[PDB]
């Protein structure tokens, strides 16, 4: 059973290479870039996607996780259309994986383009809870299939044509006090960093913890303190996240928690 839907999930997972073109280069660097596509799909029309470039152990593992990966659905998690493997001419698989176009990019670029002229208007404060609503429906999502992100920031929040977040891409300044000291880490671990991106987000961008650095954060942590409130930040949304980071990871609230504690406050917004 547990085979047999592996099984399934797997035959699913993989587009024929032909179905795909390529087109320019939105973002390249270490493991990879990210580029523009189409895909052809089954009613014969083509899809604007995005494409993500990257031991045949290695190979199977990357499929694997593509097929847990593709079976979530949910309008705040990013959906996974596929994945392609193209071989090099020095002989290296070269794993390709495809989603959906976000028109807007990563949610962390767009706060900071919001602060220029030419960029988005100035989010209302309105708009910036509503991401982190968004946000923490994705999260809850992901918690309830007992699936860990890892790697939970505004930089990996995509914003959809319809200015939708879902979360994607599943750090010293995010990781909680308990995954610093002993590596070990929980869904409240991801809470931890889902407080850490409210405040990205209320702040447009800025950088955690400014004047403090990577290599002070343990002990910064250690004595208590944690991020400030920012200027213009209403107090019910600090408290919110203020309570991610609380010492025990079994005092912070769940990712369910969160998500019916922000709706309320966004719903109590004239
Ligand atoms: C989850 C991985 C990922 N998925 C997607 C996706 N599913 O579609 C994706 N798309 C994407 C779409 C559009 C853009 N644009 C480019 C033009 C820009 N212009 C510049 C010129 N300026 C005058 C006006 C603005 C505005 C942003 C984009 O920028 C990088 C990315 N990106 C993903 N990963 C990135 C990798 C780099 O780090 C951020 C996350
Ligand atoms: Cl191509
Ligand atoms: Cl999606
Ligand atoms: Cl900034
Ligand atoms: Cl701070």
Partial sequence: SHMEELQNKLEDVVIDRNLLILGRILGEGEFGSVMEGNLKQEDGTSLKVAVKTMSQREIEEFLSEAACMKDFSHPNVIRLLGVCIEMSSQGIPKPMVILPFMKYGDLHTYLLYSRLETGPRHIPLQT???????????????????????????????????????????????????????????????????????????????????????????????????????????????????????????????????????????????
Wanted: include cysteine.
């Fill in 128 to 270: 910036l809870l509503r991401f982190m609503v968004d946000i923490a429906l994705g999260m809850e999502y992901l918690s309830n299939r007992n699936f860990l992100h890892r790697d939970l920031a505004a930089r990996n929040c995509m914003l959809r044509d319809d200015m939708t977040v879902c979360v994607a891409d599943f750090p010293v300044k995010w990781i909680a006090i308990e995954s610093l000291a002993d590596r070990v880490y929980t869904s409240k671990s991801d809470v931890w960093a889902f407080g850490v991106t409210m405040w990205e987000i209320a702040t447009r961008g800025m950088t955690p913890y400014p004047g403090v650095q990577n290599h002070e954060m343990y002990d910064y942590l250690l004595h208590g303190h944690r991020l400030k409130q920012p200027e213009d930040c209403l107090d019910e949304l600090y408290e919110i996240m203020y309570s991610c980071w609380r010492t025990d990871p079994l005092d912070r609230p769940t990712f369910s928690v969160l998500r019916l504690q922000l709706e309320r406050l966004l719903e109590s917004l004239p």
